[PDB]
Amino acid sequence: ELRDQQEQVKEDMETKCFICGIGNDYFDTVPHGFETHTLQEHNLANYL
Amino acid sequence: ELRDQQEQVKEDMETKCFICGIGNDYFDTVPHGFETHTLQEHNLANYLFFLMYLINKDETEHTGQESYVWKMYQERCWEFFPAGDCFRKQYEDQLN
Amino acid sequence: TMSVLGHYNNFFFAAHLLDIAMGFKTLRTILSSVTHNGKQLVLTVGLLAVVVYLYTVVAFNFFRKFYNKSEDGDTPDMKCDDMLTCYMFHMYVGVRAGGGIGDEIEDPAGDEYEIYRIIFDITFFFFVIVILLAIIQGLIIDAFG
Amino acid sequence: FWKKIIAYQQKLLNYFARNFYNMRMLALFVAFAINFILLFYKVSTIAVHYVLEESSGYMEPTLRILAILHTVISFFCIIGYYCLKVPLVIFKREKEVARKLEFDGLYITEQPSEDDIKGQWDRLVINTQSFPNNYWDKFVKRKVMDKYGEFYGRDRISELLGMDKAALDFSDAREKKKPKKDSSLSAVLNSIDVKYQMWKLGVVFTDNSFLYLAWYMTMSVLGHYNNFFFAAHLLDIAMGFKTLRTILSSVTHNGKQLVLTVGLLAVVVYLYTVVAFNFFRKFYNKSEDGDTPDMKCDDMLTCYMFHMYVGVRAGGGIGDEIEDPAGDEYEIYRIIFDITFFFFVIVILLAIIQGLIIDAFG
Amino acid sequence: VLLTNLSEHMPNDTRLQTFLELAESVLNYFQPFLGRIEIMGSAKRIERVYFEISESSRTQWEKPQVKESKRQFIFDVVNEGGEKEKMELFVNFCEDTIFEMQLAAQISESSILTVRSALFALRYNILTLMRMLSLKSLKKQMKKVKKMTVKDMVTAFFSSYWSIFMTLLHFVASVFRGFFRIIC
Ligand SMILES: Nc1ncnc2c1ncn2[C@@H]1O[C@H](COP(=O)(O)OP(=O)(O)OP(=O)(O)O)[C@@H](O)[C@H]1O
Ligand SMILES: Nc1ncnc2c1ncn2[C@@H]1O[C@H](COP(=O)(O)OP(=O)(O)OP(=O)(O)O)[C@@H](O)[C@H]1O
Ligand SMILES: [Zn+2]
Ligand SMILES: [Zn+2]
């Protein structure tokens, strides 16, 4: 169960944005779109 | 955990293309589309053979595309690799 | 009825402690591990009984001389002269033993059936003690998962 | 006459094929009854002879009748198998060989690997006239004709497949047919295809399930000479019950890894035996009488047998069975020896086996 | 390469189709040696590139060791990897594999008995079973069973399968004897 919980956390944070919740593929229509969105536009550290 | 990792590897390689990353269903709109795309258009062995041929080919004899890829590879920029796009998606309307 | 009989014999009140399974849901979650695969748990015991019966057949036909269980040399307590007694021995003592039937039967050292008996004991330990009990534990863990 | 006997034969075959499974269940039930009767023998006092002791006195005739019935049902289960399940095997084999002949040319272009029993044995059925006897496609020999005739020689392909050009020319040409009777038994003997039946018998003999049923019948027959041979029939429960098969799948799923685990355990125990034989040979005395010492590690084979039998079956390891190393100049080394033996052999490897079974379940 | 480029960039062209049929043989010959990839071109468009794959390169790629290396690389890049460095790890693996295949090409310069025994036993034992009918000497038996009885009928029916099971037992014993002789 601990392993499954860790894997679920990793999958969620890799497949959907923390703030808006939009999936990764929509941003990935532009190359590196998900990384750009989650590290420049909707970064939680930026909100903090 | 080892079994789960093996299953995850199999599922990823069966559901999405290695290079572009587009899902299997989009190609599967055409019969055998995913297999055709992953074995003829975006085959990783084909990219390996292209790098081999470009390395073993003389620089003066390079064509325009080969020179472009050669410069990009020398500068270690991997933008020439298709990411999120393919020939089918780029020529969707004209091809069909 | 149990409560009424408890007046005649006060120890009949101990049966009421079996109500904790229904009393507590958290204990029901634990018991679900056993009850989830109960049919397979019973079939595992049936298969174990068949395997032990086969071993009893082999021992009764070939290794009957190593089942003396008496220290006094005057009176020998042979436990495999009877098929039912040999099966009871194998199912009780051999199964409950940590090392198998060889932990309880006589040493085969310096015997013309030494190799066959050693194979007998090793196979008993591997198939019965190791594999089948592991099957039971795996059933419980699989029920949890 | 001929029609009546053929009809009666067909009735018998149909009955056996219909009741094949019920007879297979009945054989198991009779096996459980016989083995329950066998549980009440006594050894009587040299020449020792096995008697059935009972207060009733009937259960010896019960045992005889049950053994005869079990043998008869075992024979009938072979007959029912041959009438019911054999045709499916022949159909599958004829389909496979036909597809290999057509779409692979396994006897025209390339040849069998000479290590394939099926590929070598299937060369006989091609030349037979009764080919697709069970497979529906009766034009496979003409498809091979039309595919490989021009390239590899039409007459050569015809010789391979057994077709006769003169036969077809004779059929097309003008002749006068002469009547024949099925009543002519010499004619029917000439009509039967010896080669095709030989290939069919070979396929049946190479079939695994038919071999299992033959072993069952042989076991049942030997049970008359020795009544305890009927205990081997209790091994049929795995095939009898699917629920028991689900349990056994846990063991059989990782059988290769389970065997390799035992091999690794044997190697580890051999290494420990080497160490003990070279350094700790004085602690392996196994006799209480001080006059005669029963050294168990003076011989390499004896030491290995000791370590594999007693040390492995012991709950604490070899140290539970070898002499206490207290007050010895090799005390620390021997204690490390025992602890490592207990940890690696008793704890880890057995846990590997259990984990294999649980992983198979999952 | 020219014809393939034209065919792929002009999909629905009946005029080009006929030339494709006329050049079918050459295209079939050169199919293994023709490479095809897609890249993000300088004109901000996806472009297909056609190159030459060598026969030696193909063989060294299909060697089992390179396939195991490919499987390990895929496992690693999938389980522990990121989208940023995926295409860097892939190029590193490609370079290492290319060097190893070139070195392999450089250095690379220049039971049946059991099956036969089983086949022989199977032929011999079944021929023994069929001899009773191949000799065509069953006339005396037919003479003794002119009298048609349902009991004799059923007895012969069972006897056929009994003879089959002796033939199978004999074949199995012969196989075991042959295997023991071969191993010893
Ligand atoms: N709103 C978000 N803000 C930040 N990261 C997000 C957000 N939504 C999704 N992500 C994803 O979460 C991941 C963040 O990575 P991670 O937390 O491991 O970063 P790190 O600071 O490098 O961590 P580590 O301590 O392991 O070095 C990325 O894959 C990123 O795409
Ligand atoms: N870019 C890609 N290149 C190649 N295969 C890809 C790619 N993307 C996805 N795939 C998929 O990965 C799988 C490749 O199969 P695999 O690696 O087992 O091939 P193989 O050479 O036959 O392997 P094996 O050594 O097991 O015989 C296919 O299902 C294919 O669709
Ligand atoms: Zn967002
Ligand atoms: Zn792709």
Residue numbers in the entry:
A (entry chain A): 4872 to 4919
B (entry chain B): 4872 to 4967
C (entry chain D): 4727 to 4871
D (entry chain C): 4480 to 4524, 4555 to 4871
E (entry chain B): 4100 to 4209, 4237 to 4310
Authors' account:
We also present the cryo-EM structures of the PKA-phosphorylated human CPVT-linked RyR2-R420Q and RyR2-R420W under conditions that resemble those present during diastole and show that both mutant channels are in the primed state and that the Rycal drug ARM210 stabilizes the closed state of the mutant channels. Similarly to RyR2-R2474S10, we detected an increased density in the cleft of the RY1&2 domain of RyR2-R420Q, RyR2-R420W treated with ARM210, where Rycals were shown to bind. We also detected an increased density in between the BSol1 and RY1&2 domains. This suggests that binding of ARM210 to the RY1&2 domain affects the local structure and stabilizes the interaction with the BSol1 domain, which in turn stabilizes the upward-inward conformation of the cytoplasmic shell associated with a stable closed pore of the channel in agreement with our previous reports. As expected, we found that the primed state exhibited weakened affinity for calstabin-2 (50-100% increase in Kd caused by increased koff) and treatment with ARM210, which reverses the primed state, increased the affinity of calstabin-2 to RyR2.
Ryanodine receptor type 2 (RyR2), an intracellular Ca2+ release channel located on the sarcoplasmic reticulum (SR) of cardiomyocytes, is essential for cardiac muscle excitation-contraction coupling. Structurally, RyR2 is a 2.3 MDa homotetramer consisting of two functional regions: a massive cytoplasmic region, also known as the cytoplasmic shell, which comprises several regulatory domains (NTDs, NSol, SPRYs, RYs, JSol, and BSol domains) and the stabilizing subunit calstabin-2, and an activation core and pore region, which comprises the Ca2+ binding site and the transmembrane domains. Dysregulation of Ca2+ handling, characterized by aberrant SR Ca2+ leak, is a pivotal pathophysiological mechanism in a spectrum of cardiac disorders, including heart failure (HF), atrial fibrillation, catecholaminergic polymorphic ventricular tachycardia (CPVT), and other arrhythmogenic disorders. Here, we solved the cryogenic electron microscopy structures of ryanodine receptor 2 variants linked either to heart failure or inherited sudden cardiac death.
